[PDB]
Amino acid sequence: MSLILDDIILSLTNANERTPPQALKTTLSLLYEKSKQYGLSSPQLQALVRLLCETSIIDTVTKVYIVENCFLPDGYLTKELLLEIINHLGTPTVFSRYRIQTPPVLQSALCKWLVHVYFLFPVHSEREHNISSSIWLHLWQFSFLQKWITPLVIWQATTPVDVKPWKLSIIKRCAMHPGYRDAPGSATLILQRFQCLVGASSQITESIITINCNRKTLKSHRNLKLDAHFLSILKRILSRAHPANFPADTVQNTIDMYLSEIHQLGADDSTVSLWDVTSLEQLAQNWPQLHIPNDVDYMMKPRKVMSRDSLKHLYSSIILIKNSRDESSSPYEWCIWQLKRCFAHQIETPQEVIPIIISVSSMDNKLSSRIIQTFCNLKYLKLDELTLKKVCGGILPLWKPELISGTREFFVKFMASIFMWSTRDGNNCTFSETCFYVLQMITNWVLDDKLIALGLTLLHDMQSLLTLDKIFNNATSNRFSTMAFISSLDILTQLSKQTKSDYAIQYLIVGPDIMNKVFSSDDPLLLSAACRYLVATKNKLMQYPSTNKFVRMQNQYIMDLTNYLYRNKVLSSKSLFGVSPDFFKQILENLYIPTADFKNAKFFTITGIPALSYICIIILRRLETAENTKIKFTSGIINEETFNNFFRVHHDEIGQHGWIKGVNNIHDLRVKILMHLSNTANPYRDIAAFLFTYLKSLSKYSVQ
Amino acid sequence: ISRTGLADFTRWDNLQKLVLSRVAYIDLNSIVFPKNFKSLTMKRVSKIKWWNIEENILKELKVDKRTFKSLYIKFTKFFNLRHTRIKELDKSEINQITYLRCQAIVWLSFRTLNHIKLQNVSEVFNNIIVPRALFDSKRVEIYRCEKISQVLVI
Amino acid sequence: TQLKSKHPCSVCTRRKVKCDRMIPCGNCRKRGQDSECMKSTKLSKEYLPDLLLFWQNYEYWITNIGLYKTKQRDLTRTPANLDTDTEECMFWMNYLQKDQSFQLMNFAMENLGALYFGSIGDISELYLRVEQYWDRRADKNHSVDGKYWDALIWSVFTMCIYYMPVEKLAEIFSVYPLHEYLGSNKRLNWEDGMQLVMCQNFARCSLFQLKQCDFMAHPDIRLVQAYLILATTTFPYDEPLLANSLLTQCIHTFKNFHVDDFRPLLNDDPVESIAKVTLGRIFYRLCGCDYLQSGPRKPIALHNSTEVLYWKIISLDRDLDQYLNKSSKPPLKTLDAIRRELDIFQYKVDSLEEDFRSNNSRFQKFIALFQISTVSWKLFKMYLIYYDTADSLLKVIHYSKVIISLIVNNFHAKSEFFNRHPMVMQTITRVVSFISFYQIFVESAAVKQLLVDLTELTANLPTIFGSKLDKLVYLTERLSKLKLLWDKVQLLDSGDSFYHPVFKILQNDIKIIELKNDEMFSLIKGLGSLVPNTEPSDFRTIVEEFQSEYNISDILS
């Protein structure tokens, strides 16, 4: 690609004095096509522009032609290439008589080239530009190239500082000089350009009127004629070399406005305050010169829009970019001081301060660590329960501490403080609500690869406290405790699905006798979670041996749950939830039933469980309306004694229509309601799904 | 050995002999062996937990453990050791079909094991159950086990 | 979204303000009525791949085993062989005459080529043996060497009659003397049954001579040669137990020679080197018959240009069917590997142009052409049955039509015995069962026209196989009735798996066949001293009605 183009330039440099008949022309001919195709990057141009002046074997006629045609730059052409051209520019003298003189026509052609590609010049560091501007002004005094650097000098000098009286004297004297024939035309535009920079400049208008001409040539001198073919290829070359850089439309536009500037001549650490900053684009230029006036009232108390208030929240952020964040930062102390006042109610009202500080404290997790660690105290809860609750919902689930990895021991003591606070108070239900946010935070710990075991250990201590008599009960309790517990089971269920986390399996496996509490409690939603957890657990624990503590308690759960749900053979079993079945018997004879045909079979089944008793009736009533049978089910509970008595009374009418089709007895009924319960989408589909797998009779109809 | 709870060697499909030395606590329930695993030798091990096989025999027998303690009855002269005592399950009380079921239970935890060796142990927190086939071939080596009280052969 | 019709809701065409094109209907969802959507045309996927996984187990335990290699016999009812009860074997020998047998040998010169040539070679020397056979009959003295040639020629006669056309049977044999012995009707001469019942009697004559020669104690190479001829006909499929025992003895006698490399040796004798070359083609046939007869019954297994080409073609088919019984998933790289050779070895099949003047060349070309077709169908069905590649659906259809038109092409130009080759059933039984199983779950127009011409092809086969023809149509009828039961009963969706009565039928179908191939019940009986809930609803009636109507024990003889 560009390596061969380097060789072509090197080919004209490696060989000298050969004087071939056509080999030199062929290399130049190869340079004609290679220059436009590959762009002649800046390092190549520096060697090429030095080669033309170094070697005089090639005629100056073709030296101008290659500058006009081959010099189509795609590179950055920094000041190093321009300095080499500046070295080529000049005239021989007594001091430089030994140095070979470059042709003046080649210098004029070279001066014509960078004018076309001035738009590609680097954005200067405003340190060597003063040297370059003086150099160009000194080079401007040569007549053969005065007509081409004159449009250039108009361009790089855009400031009142660049309008220097010593530069004014040189430009004016050349026009006043008789032996130029073009300086009065050249000086007039430069003086006009310098006029618009400094202002009125009554000294510059008295010089122009002395050097004024008939101004037809000035009109022609105002217009700068750049070759359209030169720019058309240049636009294509620039786009190809650098995609999404130097667009062709803007490259033509940038040249045009540089040309229009010449036409307009005839018609015509530094401290910057953050208070006055309004535009982010200006802020980008002001970034090296940004300075923040230290005022605490504003920088947090008032975006895609453009305004000073658009950068409002960014002001609190750019200072953290300007200087490293620290605990002594004024914005970081304002929130704590405002927070300190709001708990003590020394502020006017805490309601409006919270949303702004919460958003600030939502990010900057290292800062949020300081806020949470100091205000998580028992004493700070005594002042007001609601204000502690509000801040628990903002910064708890979004915090991931990595400073010491020893904050787990602080939470168990502090979490128990709220619980103990709720005991003697007598409930408020504020303990369960505060736990749910911690569970959200725990999953954030679980999501992170670090401290996976640390988070799981914290979760286990929650279940022991959550499963106490006063906070969790099947007789007198709150939905808050159960709804907090059902979310915890989903965390472990989701943890089982993840395979990228290689954690400790005893953490996933829940306690042996703690599942008797969840199973015995007749909360229909709670029982749904247990079936999901049991099914997901059995997906794992397959490589474990037949004899093991983890797999023995899992099989015990499956057998006990099915006996309590559908098997209806608890008495024949040896135990149920760690309780001997004969204990159940003793209660039964003490219980009274007006007509006890099958006393034992009514209580222990899917229909007899109080959690799933009435929802069983609801599904049946839906079936009766859909099928539109002759007789509806008048009873309120489904059991063996009601079903046969219902069929025995209407046995004459059973023979012709009976009941809903597809069912012959109660045993068929108990599944038919479950088929609908499994068919529809509802929270207790999970109950039927669990019972399908471990019923071996119905598993036959499934494939494999 | 089971620091992470579970220990397996299934991926080592060609493993045949495993040697454990200078380990404090080893539980055989957590360890999972491959299909061709045949020999297991342990030396200078502090604590050992044998396979938890006793209750599985109890369920099949449906006999109380205290009553089962009255069931067992006290070639081995070639390799008798004073440290332990050899006890066997009685054949008169157990039916032949029932006895065959009892032997099959023991082999459930003895899938492909052929050689077992005990050397310099300190305590075993359960009854030691070994099949009659491995014991009668002198492939059960309870050596320097002065702390082991009894071993049951079924 | 899966929109292929772009046709409006028919109920909603009444007021067609909008059409969301959603299933069942966006307008119906706004209307909240799915029943009204069902009343219209209006133009469930996770059960098809698992069932295709299950199909491989089904066809291995039904078509391959339980239809051909199964046999149920009770020793108590079966009468043992007694003295003076072998006169039927002698009667059939006396029925054959000296002149009649020579015409049989003349027919095998050009019509039975590429079958006998693999094992016995030319029959020119056999013409000398048959002349000696008639002379040896008069003499009372017999020799073991003489009896082996006696049994070998009788094996050839069984192969000749099984293959010669019915019209050539009339002028060679007189059916009248055969009526009074069999006791059957005199109205039928050679149409069906009579020709078949003649084949087994001659086949039993060949085995009787070996028992008369006491081959139990005298080993010879002719024992292997005789059996390989019996493998050309349908004899092994009729008595799977007899053929498996005979194959083991053939392997036992063959392994006594202990030949590692069968290539000719320059340092050995020229006749010995030649004898080792012709022993190579016998070994290849033994290896081929081992794979063709592979099953749970036989536990002992043993591991010129056209013969080697024929053998390694079966080796190509060996890799495909090894995954049928196992539940493992073959890797894709080896699964697509076979195709890159399947096309190059089908290019060498048609490399030999033809030779129309002799039927020997035509038959071998027909057999070779049939080999590639029956293994390409398996390879392309291999794509669908595990990977569900879209392009394989059409190719499976296309290759199945190739064997459809290949058999019917043989009925037009004096090649009616071309379709009597035993393995033509093996190819067609697998293709008619897969499409029938495919049509009960996926309905397509292309496959519908593919089933109608297959069931007629089975009825067009020659009626020399007999009972095996009647068993396959019954199996297809049972599969045809399943789609009548699949659509009538709605599919249940538990959320993770489907439950249908037809699935129970398929799973219970395999269990019964596996029960028949169980020797534990025979072991306890053979000793002679050690032998003396929660069913949901309305599904037992469906499954038991079909089980009572159609029983898989019917296809078992």
PDB file of N, CA and C in Angstrom, chain B residues 44-76:
ATOM      1  N   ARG B  44      -2.198 -43.011  58.562  1.00  0.00           N
ATOM      2  CA  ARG B  44      -1.958 -41.875  59.453  1.00  0.00           C
ATOM      3  C   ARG B  44      -3.073 -40.837  59.344  1.00  0.00           C
ATOM      4  N   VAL B  45      -4.310 -41.316  59.266  1.00  0.00           N
ATOM      5  CA  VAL B  45      -5.492 -40.462  59.222  1.00  0.00           C
ATOM      6  C   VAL B  45      -6.069 -40.362  60.627  1.00  0.00           C
ATOM      7  N   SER B  46      -6.456 -39.148  61.023  1.00  0.00           N
ATOM      8  CA  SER B  46      -6.902 -38.924  62.394  1.00  0.00           C
ATOM      9  C   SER B  46      -8.336 -39.403  62.603  1.00  0.00           C
ATOM     10  N   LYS B  47      -9.291 -38.803  61.898  1.00  0.00           N
ATOM     11  CA  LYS B  47     -10.701 -39.122  62.070  1.00  0.00           C
ATOM     12  C   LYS B  47     -11.278 -39.666  60.771  1.00  0.00           C
ATOM     13  N   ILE B  48     -12.079 -40.722  60.888  1.00  0.00           N
ATOM     14  CA  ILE B  48     -12.680 -41.390  59.740  1.00  0.00           C
ATOM     15  C   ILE B  48     -14.152 -41.640  60.031  1.00  0.00           C
ATOM     16  N   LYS B  49     -15.010 -41.285  59.078  1.00  0.00           N
ATOM     17  CA  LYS B  49     -16.444 -41.533  59.166  1.00  0.00           C
ATOM     18  C   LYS B  49     -16.822 -42.520  58.067  1.00  0.00           C
ATOM     19  N   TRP B  50     -17.172 -43.741  58.465  1.00  0.00           N
ATOM     20  CA  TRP B  50     -17.497 -44.793  57.515  1.00  0.00           C
ATOM     21  C   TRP B  50     -18.826 -44.504  56.821  1.00  0.00           C
ATOM     22  N   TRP B  51     -19.111 -45.294  55.787  1.00  0.00           N
ATOM     23  CA  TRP B  51     -20.377 -45.162  55.085  1.00  0.00           C
ATOM     24  C   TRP B  51     -21.530 -45.451  56.032  1.00  0.00           C
ATOM     25  N   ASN B  52     -22.596 -44.673  55.892  1.00  0.00           N
ATOM     26  CA  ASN B  52     -23.663 -44.641  56.884  1.00  0.00           C
ATOM     27  C   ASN B  52     -24.686 -45.701  56.471  1.00  0.00           C
ATOM     28  N   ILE B  53     -24.352 -46.960  56.764  1.00  0.00           N
ATOM     29  CA  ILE B  53     -25.102 -48.100  56.241  1.00  0.00           C
ATOM     30  C   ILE B  53     -26.008 -48.761  57.282  1.00  0.00           C
ATOM     31  N   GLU B  54     -25.839 -48.447  58.569  1.00  0.00           N
ATOM     32  CA  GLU B  54     -26.518 -49.209  59.614  1.00  0.00           C
ATOM     33  C   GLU B  54     -28.037 -49.070  59.540  1.00  0.00           C
ATOM     34  N   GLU B  55     -28.544 -47.854  59.309  1.00  0.00           N
ATOM     35  CA  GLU B  55     -29.990 -47.641  59.374  1.00  0.00           C
ATOM     36  C   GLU B  55     -30.708 -48.320  58.218  1.00  0.00           C
ATOM     37  N   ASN B  56     -30.049 -48.431  57.062  1.00  0.00           N
ATOM     38  CA  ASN B  56     -30.672 -49.083  55.918  1.00  0.00           C
ATOM     39  C   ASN B  56     -30.947 -50.548  56.212  1.00  0.00           C
ATOM     40  N   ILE B  57     -30.062 -51.197  56.967  1.00  0.00           N
ATOM     41  CA  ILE B  57     -30.320 -52.558  57.419  1.00  0.00           C
ATOM     42  C   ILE B  57     -31.481 -52.577  58.406  1.00  0.00           C
ATOM     43  N   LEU B  58     -31.573 -51.552  59.259  1.00  0.00           N
ATOM     44  CA  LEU B  58     -32.633 -51.514  60.262  1.00  0.00           C
ATOM     45  C   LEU B  58     -34.011 -51.419  59.621  1.00  0.00           C
ATOM     46  N   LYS B  59     -34.151 -50.602  58.572  1.00  0.00           N
ATOM     47  CA  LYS B  59     -35.453 -50.453  57.928  1.00  0.00           C
ATOM     48  C   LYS B  59     -35.924 -51.768  57.323  1.00  0.00           C
ATOM     49  N   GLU B  60     -35.025 -52.490  56.651  1.00  0.00           N
ATOM     50  CA  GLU B  60     -35.396 -53.778  56.074  1.00  0.00           C
ATOM     51  C   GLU B  60     -35.750 -54.787  57.158  1.00  0.00           C
ATOM     52  N   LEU B  61     -34.969 -54.824  58.240  1.00  0.00           N
ATOM     53  CA  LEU B  61     -35.247 -55.764  59.319  1.00  0.00           C
ATOM     54  C   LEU B  61     -36.510 -55.389  60.083  1.00  0.00           C
ATOM     55  N   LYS B  62     -36.827 -54.095  60.160  1.00  0.00           N
ATOM     56  CA  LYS B  62     -37.959 -53.599  60.945  1.00  0.00           C
ATOM     57  C   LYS B  62     -37.858 -54.054  62.399  1.00  0.00           C
ATOM     58  N   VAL B  63     -36.645 -54.009  62.942  1.00  0.00           N
ATOM     59  CA  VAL B  63     -36.357 -54.456  64.298  1.00  0.00           C
ATOM     60  C   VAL B  63     -35.720 -53.303  65.059  1.00  0.00           C
ATOM     61  N   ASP B  64     -36.124 -53.136  66.318  1.00  0.00           N
ATOM     62  CA  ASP B  64     -35.556 -52.089  67.156  1.00  0.00           C
ATOM     63  C   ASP B  64     -34.057 -52.298  67.327  1.00  0.00           C
ATOM     64  N   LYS B  65     -33.321 -51.188  67.414  1.00  0.00           N
ATOM     65  CA  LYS B  65     -31.865 -51.267  67.495  1.00  0.00           C
ATOM     66  C   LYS B  65     -31.417 -52.023  68.740  1.00  0.00           C
ATOM     67  N   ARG B  66     -32.078 -51.781  69.874  1.00  0.00           N
ATOM     68  CA  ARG B  66     -31.750 -52.523  71.088  1.00  0.00           C
ATOM     69  C   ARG B  66     -32.021 -54.011  70.910  1.00  0.00           C
ATOM     70  N   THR B  67     -33.151 -54.357  70.292  1.00  0.00           N
ATOM     71  CA  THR B  67     -33.407 -55.752  69.951  1.00  0.00           C
ATOM     72  C   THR B  67     -32.406 -56.252  68.917  1.00  0.00           C
ATOM     73  N   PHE B  68     -32.055 -55.403  67.946  1.00  0.00           N
ATOM     74  CA  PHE B  68     -31.048 -55.776  66.959  1.00  0.00           C
ATOM     75  C   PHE B  68     -29.693 -56.019  67.607  1.00  0.00           C
ATOM     76  N   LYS B  69     -29.425 -55.374  68.745  1.00  0.00           N
ATOM     77  CA  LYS B  69     -28.185 -55.627  69.466  1.00  0.00           C
ATOM     78  C   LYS B  69     -28.128 -57.038  70.035  1.00  0.00           C
ATOM     79  N   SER B  70     -29.265 -57.724  70.116  1.00  0.00           N
ATOM     80  CA  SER B  70     -29.313 -59.121  70.520  1.00  0.00           C
ATOM     81  C   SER B  70     -29.314 -60.076  69.335  1.00  0.00           C
ATOM     82  N   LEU B  71     -29.198 -59.562  68.110  1.00  0.00           N
ATOM     83  CA  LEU B  71     -29.233 -60.398  66.917  1.00  0.00           C
ATOM     84  C   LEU B  71     -27.849 -60.902  66.520  1.00  0.00           C
ATOM     85  N   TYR B  72     -26.856 -60.017  66.478  1.00  0.00           N
ATOM     86  CA  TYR B  72     -25.517 -60.432  66.090  1.00  0.00           C
ATOM     87  C   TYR B  72     -24.905 -61.341  67.150  1.00  0.00           C
ATOM     88  N   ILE B  73     -24.095 -62.290  66.691  1.00  0.00           N
ATOM     89  CA  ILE B  73     -23.477 -63.292  67.551  1.00  0.00           C
ATOM     90  C   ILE B  73     -21.974 -63.277  67.315  1.00  0.00           C
ATOM     91  N   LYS B  74     -21.208 -63.353  68.402  1.00  0.00           N
ATOM     92  CA  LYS B  74     -19.759 -63.442  68.291  1.00  0.00           C
ATOM     93  C   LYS B  74     -19.370 -64.695  67.516  1.00  0.00           C
ATOM     94  N   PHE B  75     -10.901 -69.702  60.218  1.00  0.00           N
ATOM     95  CA  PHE B  75     -10.009 -69.072  59.251  1.00  0.00           C
ATOM     96  C   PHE B  75      -9.418 -67.772  59.786  1.00  0.00           C
ATOM     97  N   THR B  76     -10.179 -67.024  60.591  1.00  0.00           N
ATOM     98  CA  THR B  76      -9.692 -65.739  61.084  1.00  0.00           C
ATOM     99  C   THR B  76      -8.522 -65.885  62.048  1.00  0.00           C
TER     100      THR B  76
END
